[PDB]
């Protein structure tokens, strides 16, 4: 929809979401970074 609002909504939640997963991700890249 071209008429959707492009500006950011300031009413978004500014607090940290405690329901984010506290477990460490096993899917992180295990290879050394050449960059």
């Amino acid at each position: 929809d071209p008429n959707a609002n492009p500006n950011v909504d300031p009413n978004a939640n500014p607090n940290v979401d405690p329901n984010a997963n506290p477990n460490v991700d096993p899917n992180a890249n295990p290879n050394a970074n050449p960059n």
Partner: antibody, heavy 124, light 106 residues
Framework: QVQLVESGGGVVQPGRSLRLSCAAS????????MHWVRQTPGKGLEWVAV????????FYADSVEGRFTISRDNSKNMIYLQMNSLRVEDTAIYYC?????????????????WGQGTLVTVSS | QIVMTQSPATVSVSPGERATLSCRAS??????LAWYQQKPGQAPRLLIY???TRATGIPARFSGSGSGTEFTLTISSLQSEDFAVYFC????????FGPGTKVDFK
């Protein structure tokens, strides 16, 4: 003092590519979405493209669909419009204008602050 | 999308008189319509946004009204600096602009 300055104008031959840059200052750039407006004598104002606050969603007009590319760099506060394969119908004054004066969820798409504009001429 | 027209093309109104402009859209645009001020050599300036609300710094002299497919822009007492061409835009479905109505001295 929302100041928008347009550059990258000039004269180019048909079938080539030109790049327009629009520098924005006087407001939080990354929190708003910018547009591109075309003014052709004998036709009036014509919309070109719109970009989101982070460039996630881009919408172009039919007359420029598939040929013009809009982009933005929030780390430099600049708005770009890449016009590839320009034609003789693209000669007009191009305006960089911000969407809305302030945030209103149900009111967006009108232009609050306009730039002085740059001239791009396509001819042989 | 929505074809936009303005009538009449030009108006001849002496300073201090009331000037009225009419804007008509092919399809309903509800309450999403803006007016712009085009002076020769100058970028458009936002006068009225949505249906009637006025941009900050715009004097109360500029008054907008209308809804649906009929919108009007009325100047209560036209001054010297307001002699220009006004553009009517919808942003309900797409982004289209009107042909433009120029205000001229009588």
């Amino acid at each position: 003092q929302v100041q928008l300055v347009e550059s990258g104008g000039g004269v180019v031959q048909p079938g080539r590519s030109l790049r327009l840059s629009c520098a924005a200052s006087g407001f939080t750039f990354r929190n708003f979405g910018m547009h591109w407006v075309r003014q052709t004598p004998g036709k009036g104002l014509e919309w070109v493209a719109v970009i989101w606050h982070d460039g996630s969603n881009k919408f172009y007009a039919d007359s420029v669909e598939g040929r013009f590319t809009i982009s933005r760099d929030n780390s430099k506060n600049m708005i770009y419009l890449q016009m590839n394969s320009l034609r003789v119908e693209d000669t007009a004054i191009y305006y960089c204008a911000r969407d809305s004066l302030f945030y209103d969820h149900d009111n967006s798409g009108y232009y609050g602050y306009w730039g002085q504009g740059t001239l791009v001429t396509v001819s042989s | 999308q929505i074809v936009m027209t303005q009538s009449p093309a030009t108006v001849s109104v002496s300073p201090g008189e009331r000037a009225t402009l009419s804007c008509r859209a092919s399809r309903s645009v509800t309450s999403k319509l803006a007016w712009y001020q085009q002076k020769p050599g100058q970028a458009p300036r936002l006068l009225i946004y949505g249906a009637s609300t006025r941009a900050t710094g715009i004097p109360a002299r500029f008054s907008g009204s209308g809804s649906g497919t009929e919108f009007t822009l009325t100047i209560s007492s036209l001054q010297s600096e307001d002699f220009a061409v006004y553009f009517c835009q919808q942003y309900n479905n797409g982004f289209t602009f009107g042909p433009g109505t120029k205000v001229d001295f009588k």
